[PDB]
Amino acid sequence: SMFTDWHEAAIGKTHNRMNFDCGDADLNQFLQRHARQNHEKGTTKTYVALDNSDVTRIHGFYSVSPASLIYAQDVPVFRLGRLAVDKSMQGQGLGAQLLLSAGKRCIQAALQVGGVALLIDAKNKQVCDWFKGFGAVPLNDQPLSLLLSFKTLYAALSASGRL
Amino acid sequence: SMFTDWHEAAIGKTHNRMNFDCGDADLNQFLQRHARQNHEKGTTKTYVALDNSDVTRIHGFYSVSPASLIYYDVPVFRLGRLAVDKSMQGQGLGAQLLLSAGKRCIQAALQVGGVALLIDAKNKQVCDWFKGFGAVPLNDQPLSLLLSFKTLYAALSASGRL
Amino acid sequence: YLTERDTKMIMEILDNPPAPNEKLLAAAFALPDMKK
Amino acid sequence: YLTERDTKMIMEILDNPPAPNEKLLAAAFALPDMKK
Ligand SMILES: CC(C)(COP(=O)(O)OP(=O)(O)OC[C@H]1O[C@@H](n2cnc3c(N)ncnc32)[C@H](O)[C@@H]1O)[C@@H](O)C(=O)NCCC(=O)NCCS
Numbered sequence: 001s002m003f004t005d006w007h008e009a010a011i012g013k014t015h016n017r018m019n020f021d022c023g024d025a026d027l028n029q030f031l032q033r034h035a036r037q038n039h040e041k042g043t044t045k046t047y048v049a050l051d052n053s054d055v056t057r058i059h060g061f062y063s064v065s066p067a068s069l070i071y072a073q074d075v076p077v078f079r080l081g082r083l084a085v086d087k088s089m090q091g092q093g094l095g096a097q098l099l100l101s102a103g104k105r106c107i108q109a110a111l112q113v114g115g116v117a118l119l120i121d122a123k124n125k126q127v128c129d130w131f132k133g134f135g136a137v138p139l140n141d142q143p144l145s146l147l148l149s150f151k152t153l154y155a156a157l158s159a160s161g162r163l
Numbered sequence: 164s165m166f167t168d169w170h171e172a173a174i175g176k177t178h179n180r181m182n183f184d185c186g187d188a189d190l191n192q193f194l195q196r197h198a199r200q201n202h203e204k205g206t207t208k209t210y211v212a213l214d215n216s217d218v219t220r221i222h223g224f225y226s227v228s229p230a231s232l233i234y235y236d237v238p239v240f241r242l243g244r245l246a247v248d249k250s251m252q253g254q255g256l257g258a259q260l261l262l263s264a265g266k267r268c269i270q271a272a273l274q275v276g277g278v279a280l281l282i283d284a285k286n287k288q289v290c291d292w293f294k295g296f297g298a299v300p301l302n303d304q305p306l307s308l309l310l311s312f313k314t315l316y317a318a319l320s321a322s323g324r325l
Numbered sequence: 326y327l328t329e330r331d332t333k334m335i336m337e338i339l340d341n342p343p344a345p346n347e348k349l350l351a352a353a354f355a356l357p358d359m360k361k
Numbered sequence: 362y363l364t365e366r367d368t369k370m371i372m373e374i375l376d377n378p379p380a381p382n383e384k385l386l387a388a389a390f391a392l393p394d395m396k397k
């Protein structure tokens with residue numbers, strides 16, 4: 001059914017950044033020009049999905065960081081700032097798998113240092129729709145931002161034995 | 164020199180929350196009424212320093228959570244609370260717990276990002292104590308300090324705690 | 326910096342967390358078992 | 362919500378990070394080595 005002949009690593013020097021095209025210039029240029037610097041600084045960590053045969057080929061990536069939302073009358077979260085899959089590899093479920101893997105990574109951190117949800121940044125409304133697909137709830141007053149509970153994410157990963 | 168006959172665990176059911184007195188009612192009441200519930204929810208994780216002989220006795224605790232400061236935003240971990248029992252103060256345990264919280268948050272930050280500790284000071288006596296360690300008070304919020312993971316890492320690397 | 330409307334929604338989503346859908350579940354089951 | 366003064370200060374402290382104090386160092390060395 002889904003593409004599963006890949007493995008995840010932190011963005012590294014070996015990984016072919018220039019072959020990656022997800023059909024968005026900004027996301028391509030983020031991976032090419034900014035991923036590694038930001039990962040070294042700790043501003044956002046980028047994880048890549050590599051082919052199991054060609055271990056320098058990038059099928060897709062995601063980026064995360066700690067953040068909080070302030071209630072007005074704090075919510076500790078991890079921000080999924082970016083997610084992308086190469087055009088050559090789209091429509092094979094890898095996007096979905098990366099959302100889950102980012103959930104996994106952030107939940108494991110949140111067990112140590114807190115966090116209750118994934119705050120998802122959607123670039124455009126086509127991507128925001130894609131996220132709604134997975135049960136991410138768009139905020140009304142921030143329309144290109146969604147929230148997805150760690151309870152929801154954990155339930156799914158527990159179900160499959162990824163936690 | 165410094166008290167070191169203690170061990171760190173996440174807040175648990177067996178820990179004597181009611182005997183803890185740091186001299187501040189809010190911090191005592193946080194530990195008594197809210198620590199465990201918040202730890203279960205994931206709103207803030209609380210770690211306690213237990214005596215190695217009386218393993219249910221709490222010498223001190225700290226609490227952390229992810230946060231961001233909006234200028235771009237700045238990924239941080241908030242040290243929301245730190246406290247030592249009055250009976251055990253002035254033996255360096257407070258200092259050790261600031262370091263341990265730094266360590267814990269840096270280890271998380273290696274996976275999921277973060278560059279600094281955002282420290283909440285209740286009063287100016289506590290804010291002074293933190294300045295001691297190189298925590299820089301913010302001008303616009305004087306009871307909030309920032310302490311680089313670069314600075315913290317340098318110290319933990321020096322001592323072989325990382 | 327979160328509006329009343331959203332502060333209520335979020336609070337509700339967090340107190341009463343949805344079960345995972347089939348798309349979220351399918352992904353969980355496809356994701357290769359790997360480490361931190 | 363960061364003021365101009367602090368947005369500049371923090372940016373500078375993060376780009377140009379101070380070395381650890383004797384108080385910060387002494388604590389690092391006293392902290393028992395523990396896991397998690
Ligand atoms: C496509 C993205 C989200 C990764 O998804 P990927 O296709 O790898 O994942 P997955 O196969 O699980 O999901 C795609 C499938 O879901 C369905 N789907 C795709 N888009 C939507 C949508 N907006 N709404 C509902 N269902 C959708 C389709 O059946 C499609 O086959 C990512 O690479 C992306 O879109 N990046 C941004 C690029 C952009 O903005 N424009 C260029 C796109 S070519």
Ligand SMILES: CC(C)(COP(=O)(O)OP(=O)(O)OC[C@H]1O[C@@H](n2cnc3c(N)ncnc32)[C@H](O)[C@@H]1O)[C@@H](O)C(=O)NCCC(=O)NCCS
Nearest residue numbers: 185186187246247252253254255256257258288289291292
């Ligand atoms: C006071 C805290 C940090 C305990 O730290 P602890 O004493 O274990 O830390 P440590 O031994 O590393 O440092 C204390 C030593 O620092 C020195 N020091 C330097 N500046 C200060 C200062 N502003 N306040 C206190 N001690 C200071 C003193 O020599 C003191 O012996 C903590 O318990 C706390 O703040 N709790 C809240 C209680 C409160 O605010 N009021 C009640 C105080 S009795």
